[PDB]
Symmetry: D2
Subunit: 80 residues, 4 copies
């Protein structure tokens, strides 16, 4: 209900756990059927918006697994 | 606010993700400072109760990483 | 060249890391193009044999992610 | 015997798996007692050299989990 990070099976879970560390919050596998309606900030890591809940707040993703990870690190480093 | 699974760095994350799959819920690393007061069911996987929040509901843990995993599988298999 | 554990993206990596702990060996993601010809024992965790190298020695897999994990634990517990 | 990536429990495994993807090779947990003498290139991700085998070839590590990950991405991106 404050922050949640969602990811799909595979390399993107890696990036998601780094984001979850910085935000001090939980992660969730997108394959798990879940009620996102009461989560304040829903972050998605990797892929496209259509894969995720319509309650998504922020998508962090690049062209590859490596650039998705770079995008997360950029996001983490530039938080104020 | 329904279910959350907490784990410590290492092998226990493995067991936690299996439990989170069965419960269709998020996981959280115990190193992340987090407010557990509004979570209905807090599950902890591995270790002892003193490592975790006082809002803990269910600890699933054995003597080793392998028996902790066995305990989680037992828990999953026997849910009705 | 003694032991190697191979897995596919997702839950099966979890089981593979438990097996790799017991065998004190490396793991490899099956998506990585790799030369298996010089590995003495090739273990695969989850799925079917057709997914993996023809140098496969032992497949440990069940009907589900949970029973694949059970099969690995059985294998670990019963080693002499 | 060509490439192997070693890591310690925790966040550094994340970076190690990205490196292993790029190099198409296995990963190994540093807690596993292992014979590194016949591996051509031994990569370590995170921490200091004293934690790892003396057969280590390349250490990729920063001041934090996040900068260790950045260092791996830099390494991956700049390979020719």
């Amino acid at each position: 209900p404050e922050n949640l990070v969602v990811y799909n099976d595979g390399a993107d879970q890696r990036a998601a756990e780094y984001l979850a560390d910085r935000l001090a919050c939980p992660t969730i596998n997108n394959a798990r059927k879940f009620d996102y309606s009461n989560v304040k900030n829903v972050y998605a890591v990797g892929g496209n918006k259509e894969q995720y809940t319509s309650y998504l707040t922020t998508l962090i993703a690049g062209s590859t697994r490596y650039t998705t990870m770079q995008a997360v690190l950029d996001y983490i480093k530039n938080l104020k």
